[PDB]
Scaffold this active site. Structure first.
Site, PDB file in Angstrom:
ATOM      1  CG  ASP A 113      -8.476   2.842   1.816  1.00 35.30           C
ATOM      2  OD1 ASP A 113     -10.354   2.334   1.812  1.00 35.30           O
ATOM      3  OD2 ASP A 113      -8.125   3.550   1.437  1.00 35.30           O
TER       4      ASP A 113
ATOM      5  CE  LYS B 204      -8.448  -1.495   5.136  1.00 32.96           C
ATOM      6  NZ  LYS B 204      -7.986  -2.884   5.058  1.00 32.96           N
TER       7      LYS B 204
END
Length: 214
Positions: free
Chosen positions: A154, A136
């Site tokens: 996320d 991420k």
């Protein structure tokens, strides 16, 4: 009823945003990311630190920690950096300060990243070699310095995907395999609205908050 009504309306809403002034605002932010192609290694390293700080924090907070510290991400000793982060409000000042200092062995991050065949392979290097950087964070960093085909997955998009049945369960831990799998669904949605993943990310955040940050 129609199980695909919500997906169809999301597509419709995004097309609506593309036909509004919001498009120009998001496009400008995208252009700012693209401008990193002309920025220095030092500038890129600061963005890498912004991403290292993002977890359990705020983009707005990261932006201010950036402006506050700046060159300090490269010059401050462990102790002095840990101190500024603690006083600036970051709850994980200790761990983040360590990750940042360690990342300094790759301070010429722009030259390293651009040496790779593409952003996908560069992402692999970021995740494997830099502590504090997962898929991420690596994707977030690459997007922020100009790359358009990596999703920033996320906890909020994961919840939205799960709730609207695009995925069976909220993953919690994303293995490389799972990250690329979920990234491809987002990539398909993006093409369905003719947006790159870099752009789609901002449209999604705008729908969630009405703001356009980074």
């Amino acid at each position: 009823g129609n199980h695909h009504h919500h997906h169809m309306m999301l597509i419709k809403k995004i097309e609506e945003l593309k036909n509004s002034e919001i498009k120009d605002i998001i496009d400008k932010r995208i252009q700012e990311f693209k401008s990193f192609k002309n920025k220095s290694n030092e500038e890129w390293f600061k963005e890498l630190c912004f991403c290292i700080l993002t977890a359990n924090f705020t983009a707005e907070g990261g932006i201010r920690i950036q402006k506050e510290i700046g060159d300090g991400f490269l010059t401050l000793p462990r102790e002095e950096l840990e101190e500024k982060l603690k006083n600036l409000g970051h709850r994980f000042y200790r761990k983040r300060a360590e990750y940042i200092v360690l990342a300094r062995r790759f301070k010429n991050i722009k030259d390293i990243v651009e040496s790779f065949e593409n952003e996908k392979v560069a992402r692999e290097f970021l995740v494997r070699n830099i502590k504090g950087i997962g898929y991420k964070e690596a994707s977030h960093f690459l997007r922020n310095v100009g790359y358009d085909d990596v999703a920033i997955i996320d906890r909020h998009i994961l919840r939205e995907l799960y709730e609207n049945n695009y995925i069976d369960e909220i993953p919690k831990t994303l293995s490389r395999r799972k990250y690329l799998e979920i990234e491809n669904i987002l990539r398909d949605i993006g093409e369905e609205v003719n947006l790159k993943l870099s752009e789609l990310d901002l449209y999604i955040w705008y729908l969630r908050t009405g703001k356009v940050l980074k």
